[PDB]
Write a protein that binds this ligand. Sequence first.
Ligand code: CA
Length: 169
Amino acid sequence: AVTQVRYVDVTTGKDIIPPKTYSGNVDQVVTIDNQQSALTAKGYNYTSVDSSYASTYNDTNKTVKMTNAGQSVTYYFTDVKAPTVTVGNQTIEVGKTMNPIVLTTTDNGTGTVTNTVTGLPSGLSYDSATNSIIGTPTKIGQSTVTVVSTDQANNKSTTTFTINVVDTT
Ligand SMILES: [Ca+2]
């Protein structure tokens, strides 16, 4: 007379919040919580329910009827929020090996995040292993750098910043 509930990230199969068990007497109708409000705050939309292994489940009422045999209900959620790359404009001196520019990136989900960096000044390159721009700029001038960030669910954001390469004379 138990029912195991999971709240699952459809992209990765991971628990977004801890699984919850419900119990009752045999035949007792028990209300289960799909946690939609909490998951919305986490940047997820409620997407589907799998009750293949809980035949007593009523989706309209969000109930199970407890039986001698265990039951399982899985609620699935989709990450609908793009990653956040927080980067500002940067000045660097021509012809000097730069302190790397770290492209600070976070996300609400449970999977990978991949950045795509373009428009770098001559001498600069994106080190994807350290998620940082590295190099020695070769030429005075300003460049607009574009960073596209994509999470594993394929939500995308785009940010830009300028790199200004300056000389002392
Ligand atoms: Ca996300």
